[PDB]
Design a protein around this nucleic acid. Structure first.
Ligand SMILES: [Mg+2]
Ligand SMILES: [Mg+2]
Ligand SMILES: [Mg+2]
Ligand SMILES: [Mg+2]
Ligand SMILES: [Mg+2]
Ligand SMILES: [Mg+2]
Ligand SMILES: [Mg+2]
Ligand SMILES: [Mg+2]
Ligand SMILES: [Mg+2]
Ligand SMILES: [Mg+2]
Ligand SMILES: [Mg+2]
Ligand SMILES: [Mg+2]
Ligand SMILES: [Mg+2]
Ligand SMILES: [Mg+2]
Ligand SMILES: [Mg+2]
Ligand SMILES: [Mg+2]
Ligand SMILES: [Mg+2]
Ligand SMILES: [Mg+2]
Ligand SMILES: [Mg+2]
Ligand SMILES: [Mg+2]
Ligand SMILES: [Mg+2]
Ligand SMILES: [Mg+2]
Ligand SMILES: [Mg+2]
Ligand SMILES: [Mg+2]
Ligand SMILES: [Mg+2]
Ligand SMILES: [Mg+2]
Ligand SMILES: [Mg+2]
Ligand SMILES: [Mg+2]
Ligand SMILES: [Mg+2]
Ligand SMILES: [Mg+2]
Lengths: 172, 190, 136, 197, 106
RNA sequence: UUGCUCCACACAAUAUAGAUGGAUACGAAUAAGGCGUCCUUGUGGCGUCGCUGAACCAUAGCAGGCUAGCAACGGUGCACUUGGCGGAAAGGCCUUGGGUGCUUGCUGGCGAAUUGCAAUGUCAUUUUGCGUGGGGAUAAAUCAUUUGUAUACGACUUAGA
RNA sequence: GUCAAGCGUUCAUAGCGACAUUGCUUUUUGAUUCUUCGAUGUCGGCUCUUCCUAUCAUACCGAAGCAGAAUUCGGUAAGCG
């Protein structure tokens, strides 16, 4: 789950006599593997349509890679989650070079700030925010200023020995 | 949120020299000199053009950003105190017993001593802190004027003189007797 | 009459800052910061060394004193061209930091015969050094 | 790797130093800790003073001379923190605790010996900036230690002597560095530089 | 020379143990300068002496030796497991052992 | 019934929480410092360093023998000694000079074998005893008797050539 | 403890506080029958120690429908009675 992957999953709802060639529903799923992806596919299709895994089939599952994995992108994520007392819709902005990176950051962020588990979260939408000043959140907007530069004060240097002889420094 | 960079301006007037070794600030203007240890904040001072000093916080949370404007106000108070000084004027409020405030020597330690506060036989004593000058006003009755470079010292010594004359065991909406700060300003201002 | 405020000069996370990867696959190679993703993560690019363009935590990274002029979000061909124009590797090799890295790699590479020769030459230099000290 | 290791306890967190020292003692290393009045505990002073008074509260009710013995000196607070990280009721842990000496200040022999740090335990490497901390000399004085002023006087004396030592040591290393620089750019020194030396 | 050492020093740390049961048949050794299981893979199969002193000469020596061998690495930090011909006495917890350079590979 | 102590060296017995090249000395800060240099001597200017001790010192020679020179007047061991500093437990640190060896800084000569293909292959430091030869000093305590400032008995406080 | 209809000469909350509702305690009494029926001496008082704080007094304070006096509400506090 540190590497989520994104999959398109197309499922069908199996052809009967009255309906040959059914409607081919497609989802984008964030999962660790294809097993979890097909599981989540049937989870969301049993919430949208009158279908279930026993009366349907999977016709395709493909891993979608990121088109530009080394371009920095601003993402808006619309998410629905369960709290301890209700269900809430939430919009967050996440800055990464990948959609699965944004979704991993979202899951860590939701577990951190809201104590929301994976079982309580629906990703409603991930969309790359195409233009600056459509960026709503000011924790993202601070990284879009011109000629941005900052230091990292108080550098803590990792020691591999138990004892040090020098009384180290946190210069940087 | 951890704001990336929050930064405050500090304006130095012409006759003032500010020396900031690590976070120990020394401000030297015409009235004298002042020093403040600021090693409890973790800010970063820098000098722009010998009349402007930036102070900045990097990757600082809400409380750490809140302390930065405090640091700017502390160094501005140092500059204002060594340029203009501070002058706090207190009034004696009494109904029947006239509060008798004199300044006295006890072993060279320079005390304000207060007699007849609400008819008390107890002499009260507030030590004048170093830097604070006590004088008594002419053509304004019942006014004691505390002056000095350090607003901390002048304000705390005026607060000592106010808290030493608080009323015990009486309704203090009716027994208003005390010494109160009436004016806060500067020594040399117009 | 002069206001004196200390410098306290840090290395800035900025586009064009040269970084040394400590840990991972690259691990001792030079890259350059291409864009700042957030406070704890930047996009690096080390095409001379062989570092792929990647997102990385700054904790996998030590910044160097060396910068060069790079535009934000510059692609790998741009990074390579501007890195060669600024001649980053020749600034880096002349620093005392990279000489110490080369020194400890060289002392790691020494064989037993070379360690014996290091002992013999150190005693030979030591004799002259003690003569110079006792006449100065 | 030394026969005994002398830790200068200044700027160290008490638990993070005590677990490291407990593991060195049990693994067979003799440890002497100096400047235990300059140790740190994280969290504010009133916080840690209430913790000590909560500890001070508990004693054997029928005989206070057999109670938990509330030791007041900063070296003894460090010793108490390091017990409990050692099975001290066994012979092995008794022998481990016999490998440890903790002192306030730096007394003789150790004042002319190298002092080390434990960077796993350093307050400036472990605590987030802005986090409050307690100095163990101040805490010990608040809970009844008598000798804060004597240790400060002797440490000022020791530091005057140590600075007069270090002035002579810099005056010698000036000459040694210059004489090593005279031997540089010779056929032996370039031969040594070819081998990383 | 001033030194004649052809072994690496180590510390007998512990038996193999769970939280409450020990196994004296295996002993845990720290080797000086070894902080990594792959750095400690060099020492596998090396020949260990615990060298100790007794009052009674038995074959013209007051020095007695227990011989054993590094079997596998233990954990993440360069501790190894060792087995000896007779198990280590358990008062030697923290005592110094010798890891010889033979059987040699490199 | 030649007792006690100290010093040195001969041999024994007890052991050893565990020698195996060296515990290698600023202080302070860590949103700062170290070092070098310069001046106006400061909370100064300039340069440089860190990114770990992965260092530095030391380290060649029968467990390190015997011997011959060259260069230098350095390094180092042991005792003798001069002067000083050190009381936190100093019991150490820095010196002055003369001996006394050694030196791998450089170049030579001789020896090592059979411990038979590994078997720590014994080289450390506390207690003691006893032997020998070189100094030094020449007491108390307790019972018993006694006191009553003490006291169940012990103990305590007094006295007695 | 919360809520505040209402009382408090006007005024919900100085002090109170209905209709509701959330708790804590184990110094009451029930509920239970787990331990003891080859026996754990069963009421109260006397004596004596310690502990708790939900503080009556004493210390220092905040509030009042506290002018003074005398009270009332509340805080730290079990040091001492
Ligand atoms: Mg599922
Ligand atoms: Mg939150
Ligand atoms: Mg720093
Ligand atoms: Mg009052
Ligand atoms: Mg009254
Ligand atoms: Mg040398
Ligand atoms: Mg040991
Ligand atoms: Mg324990
Ligand atoms: Mg030291
Ligand atoms: Mg005290
Ligand atoms: Mg006491
Ligand atoms: Mg085990
Ligand atoms: Mg381990
Ligand atoms: Mg064993
Ligand atoms: Mg044991
Ligand atoms: Mg500098
Ligand atoms: Mg300087
Ligand atoms: Mg003494
Ligand atoms: Mg030699
Ligand atoms: Mg009597
Ligand atoms: Mg009697
Ligand atoms: Mg409640
Ligand atoms: Mg009202
Ligand atoms: Mg029975
Ligand atoms: Mg009974
Ligand atoms: Mg209470
Ligand atoms: Mg009360
Ligand atoms: Mg009283
Ligand atoms: Mg009581
Ligand atoms: Mg009481």
């Amino acid at each position: 789950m540190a590497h989520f992957k994104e999959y398109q999953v197309i499922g069908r709802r199996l052809p009967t006599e009255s309906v040959p060639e059914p409607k081919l529903f497609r989802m984008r799923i964030f999962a660790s593997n294809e097993v979890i992806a097909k599981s989540r596919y049937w989870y969301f299709l049993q919430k949208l349509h009158k279908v279930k895994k026993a009366s349907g089939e999977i016709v395709s599952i493909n891993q979608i890679n990121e088109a530009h994995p080394t371009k920095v992108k601003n993402f808006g994520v619309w998410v629905r989650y369960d709290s301890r007392s209700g269900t809430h819709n939430m919009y967050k902005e996440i800055r990464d070079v990948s959609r699965v990176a944004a979704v991993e950051t979202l899951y860590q962020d939701m577990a951190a700030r809201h104590r929301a588990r994976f079982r309580s979260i629906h990703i409603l939408k991930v969309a790359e925010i195409e233009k600056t000043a459509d960026v709503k959140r000011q924790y993202v907007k601070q990284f879009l200023t011109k000629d941005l530069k900052f230091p990292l004060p108080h550098r803590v240097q990792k020691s591999t020995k138990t004892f040090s002889y020098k009384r180290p420094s946190t210069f940087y | 949120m951890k704001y990336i960079q929050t930064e405050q301006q500090i304006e130095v007037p012409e006759g003032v020299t500010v020396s900031i070794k690590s976070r120990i600030v020394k401000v030297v203007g015409p009235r004298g000199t002042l020093t403040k240890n600021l090693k409890h904040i973790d800010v970063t001072f820098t000098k722009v053009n010998n009349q402007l000093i930036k102070v900045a916080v990097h990757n600082g949370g809400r409380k750490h950003v809140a302390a930065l404007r405090t640091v700017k106000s502390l160094v501005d108070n140092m500059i204002t105190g060594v340029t203009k000084g501070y002058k706090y004027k207190m009034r004696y409020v009494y109904a029947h017993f006239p509060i008798n405030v004199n300044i006295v020597e006890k072993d060279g330690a320079k005390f304000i001593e207060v007699r007849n506060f609400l008819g008390d036989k107890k002499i009260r004593n507030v030590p004048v802190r170093d830097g604070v000058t006590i004088e008594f006003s002419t053509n304004v009755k019942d006014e004691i004027v505390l002056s000095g470079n350090s607003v901390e010292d002048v304000s705390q010594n005026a607060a000592d003189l106010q808290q030493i004359c608080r009323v015990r065991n009486k309704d203090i909406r009716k027994f208003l007797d005390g010494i109160y700060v009436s004016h806060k300003g500067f020594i040399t201002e117009d | 009459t002069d206001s004196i405020v200390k410098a306290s000069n840090w290395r800035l996370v900025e586009v064009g800052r040269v970084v040394l990867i400590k840990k991972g696959q690259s691990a001792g190679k030079l890259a350059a910061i291409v864009e700042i993703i957030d406070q704890k993560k930047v996009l690096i690019d080390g095409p001379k060394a062989g570092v792929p363009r990647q997102a990385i935590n700054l904790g996998q990274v030590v910044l160097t004193p060396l910068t060069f002029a790079l535009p934000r979000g510059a692609r790998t061909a741009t990074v390579s061209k501007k890195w060669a124009a600024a001649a980053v590797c020749e600034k880096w090799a002349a620093s005392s930091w990279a000489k110490k890295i080369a020194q400890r790699e060289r002392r790691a590479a020494l064989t037993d015969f070379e360690r014996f020769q290091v002992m013999v030459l150190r005693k030979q230099k030591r004799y002259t050094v003690k003569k110079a000290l006792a006449k100065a | 790797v030394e026969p005994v290791v002398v830790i200068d306890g200044k700027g160290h967190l008490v638990g993070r130093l005590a677990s490291v020292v407990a593991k060195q003692l049990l693994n067979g290393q003799k440890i002497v800790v100096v400047r235990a009045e300059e140790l740190n505990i994280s969290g504010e002073f009133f916080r840690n003073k209430l913790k000590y008074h909560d500890f001070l509260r508990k004693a054997t009710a029928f005989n206070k001379t057999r109670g938990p013995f509330h030791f007041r000196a900063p070296s003894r607070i460090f010793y108490k923190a390091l017990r409990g990280m050692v099975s001290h009721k066994t012979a092995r842990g008794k022998a481990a605790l016999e490998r440890l000496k903790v002192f306030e200040g730096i007394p003789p022999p150790y004042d002319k010996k190298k002092r080390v740090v434990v960077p796993q335990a350093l307050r400036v490497l472990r605590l987030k900036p802005g986090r409050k901390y307690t100095t163990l000399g101040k805490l010990s004085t608040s809970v009844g230690w008598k000798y804060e002023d004597v240790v400060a006087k002797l440490e000022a004396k020791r530091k005057v002597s140590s600075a007069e030592y270090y002035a002579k040591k810099r005056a010698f290393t000036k000459k040694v560095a210059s004489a090593n620089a005279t031997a540089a750019e010779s056929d032996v020194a370039k031969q040594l530089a070819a081998l990383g030396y | 020379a001033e030194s004649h050492r052809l072994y690496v020093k180590g510390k007998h740390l512990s038996y193999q143990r769970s939280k409450r049961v020990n196994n004296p048949n295996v002993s845990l050794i720290k080797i000086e300068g070894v902080a990594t299981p792959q750095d400690a893979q060099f020492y596998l199969g090396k020949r260990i002496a615990y060298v100790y002193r007794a009052s009674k000469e038995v074959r013209g020596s007051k020095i007695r030796v227990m011989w054993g061998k590094v079997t596998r690495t233990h954990g993440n930090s360069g501790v190894v497991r060792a087995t000896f011909r007779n198990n280590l006495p358990a008062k030697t917890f923290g005592a110094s052992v010798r890891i010889f350079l033979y059987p040699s590979n490199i």
